[PDB]
């Protein structure tokens, strides 16, 4: 049982997304910038509607990103001037141009949940495939969810933790966690 991971270096974010786009289809992105943490959704093709401008670094731009869908997750972090390391995590063996494949054996993987911030807002956003949670603590949170949220729905980010031996003594740990999807409970 292997967790496959694919790594590329000195690559810009928008190139990293494009180089992965056949796998990141419909992925939720979480982009990290000095001023904003924003969710995005890639097209079912995997593109983003302002991709270059959205993923540009040089003007308070994206220094870290995570893209996740059912099959895989892309991670990117800026090393210098908007060029940085991409790692894609997938439980499936897959081919990528330029990415060096690796793998980790893991003993088992276990489901985990994270409750998202907020209750369903009294109306969803005007954008299709978006919903609004809100909590007085943070205000609105627009999430790329296509289910119309019922009152007293709660949204959970589901993840899978991979457990492996860290020591030659046999000590186990969770070696990584892959984010999967938003789910309504």
């Amino acid at each position: 049982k292997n967790l496959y991971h694919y790594h590329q270096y000195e690559i810009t974010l928008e190139s990293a997304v494009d180089s992965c786009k056949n796998h990141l289809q419909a992925a939720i992105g979480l982009l990290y910038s000095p001023q904003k943490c924003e969710l995005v959704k890639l097209d079912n093709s995997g593109k983003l509607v302002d991709s270059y401008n959205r993923l540009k670094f040089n003007n308070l731009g994206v220094f870290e990103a995570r893209f996740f869908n059912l099959n895989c997750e892309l991670r990117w972090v800026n090393e210098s001037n908007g060029n940085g390391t991409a790692v894609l995590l997938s439980e499936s063996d897959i081919t990528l141009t330029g990415f060096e494949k690796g793998l980790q054996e893991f003993i088992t993987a276990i489901d985990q949940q994270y409750l998202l911030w907020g209750e369903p807002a009294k109306h969803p956003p005007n954008a299709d495939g978006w919903q609004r949670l809100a909590e007085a603590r943070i205000g609105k949170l627009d999430i790329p969810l296509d289910n119309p949220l019922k009152p007293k729905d709660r949204v959970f980010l589901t993840s899978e933790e991979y457990i492996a031996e860290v020591d030659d003594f046999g000590n186990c740990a969770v070696i990584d966690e892959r984010l999967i999807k938003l789910e309504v409970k």
Binding site: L30, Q113, L115, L116, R154, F169, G170, N171, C172, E177
Partner: protein, 555 residues
Amino acid sequence: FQGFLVLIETSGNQHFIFSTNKLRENIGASELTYLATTEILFQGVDRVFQTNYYDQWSDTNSLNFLADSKLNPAIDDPKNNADIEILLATSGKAIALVKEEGKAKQLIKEVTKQALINAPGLEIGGIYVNCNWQDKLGVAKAVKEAHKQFEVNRAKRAGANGRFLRLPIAAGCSVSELPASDFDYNADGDKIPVSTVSKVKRETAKSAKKRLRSVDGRLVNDLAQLEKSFDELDWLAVVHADGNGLGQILLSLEKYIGEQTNRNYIDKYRRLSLALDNCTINAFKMAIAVFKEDSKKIDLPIVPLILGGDDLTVICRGDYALEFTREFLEAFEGQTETHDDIKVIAQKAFGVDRLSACAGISIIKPHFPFSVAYTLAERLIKSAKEVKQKVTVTNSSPITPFPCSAIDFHILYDSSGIDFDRIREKLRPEDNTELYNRPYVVTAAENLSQAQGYEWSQAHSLQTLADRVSYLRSEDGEGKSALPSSQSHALRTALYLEKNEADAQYSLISQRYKILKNFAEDGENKSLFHLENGKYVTRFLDALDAKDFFANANH
């Protein structure tokens, strides 16, 4: 014959049990810690070796089943062939002997993986070392190596901090620092977001009432009523106790077993461990007689979190912790006096049948962080253990501590500090003066008379504090207090002055309220201070603070 010794041990019991101030989770975390090195060990042993240690335990509900080695095979007897022998199981530690390196590793994987699944946030690890059974003391050597190698790994081990990580869009736990993962209820009944860690602890609090049923049916029955009652108290206490002498024994146990054969070390080691669990739980049953019984309150106001061996850790009502811990420590010494499984080892180690324990007691408001309170109880027990240097076995070479129980405590008043060094610094109004006389010796003056430092132990006797507290509480023939609060408060103020101003004030007030003569300490009957190691120290501020914390209810 040759094999391996496996040591599996839980660490970070503070950061697991006290990382929330929610009693169900403290209770639940303490259960998960206990289960990790028993149930999860035995279920792991049963899976790895095709055995039935879990059936024997769960039918017995006790660890004594592994004493008699027809049932826990003596695998150094080749006719009683088995792959596994358990040397120790206890809260936060277990030790086993195995004849195969693979099953040593497989056991550690099994037990550690199950903690990840069933006890998220528990830090458990294990190690195996070779065990040369052809060598007498081979087990003692293996135990020493396994322990010291375990520490070297913990200096590099990947922590449990790395798994449930906050994502900016995840909400947070209502009671911890982790992201929320699902929902539970606060004591009021309201739905609240909680972590996977917090959820699993709360789920396991339901298991604790089963474990404690064999101890005392009065302990836990309505967690919600208990949790609600605690946060209506004025004071809780975090009480932490560790055995004195047990470490001094286990550093060297093959010196005290008699015959140096591994079979005797193991047999003596196991009975020593089991007997001190029995001593702990029995001394606990005796000590909980201290807590008064409320007909409305189905449960006693005490939560035994850890209850075996050296470690006793409890949360209780804070005005009853000093008497509970005194009674526990007194009951613990008497218990160890009366186990032959202990007598001969304590005799050979220390010249007395008893062992002893120190305790640290943090007395805190219910809203105070139990994390911080326990950190202080650690430093208080470290202070209580200074008896190890002061009270020693005569003509011992090297110098050895002589079994002397002691208490150090703090009551966390608002501006008192919250860390040990700051607390005590605030009680040194001048560098020549300490407004504390700690620790307090709990061992009876009769049992110490042959020790070095006997005169020291009497200056530090807890009875001296309890007397002064009695005088503060006592009344005159009017039914007014023998010392008024107004005068007590003036003496509190005087203690912070220069010693001549403090002693001048003490003269003025003791002329007027003659009961203060009993609080004098210089023997010249003219100071609340006595000189001690070049510092002027006083018991008086300890008595003023502790005035309301000697409640008892065992009269």
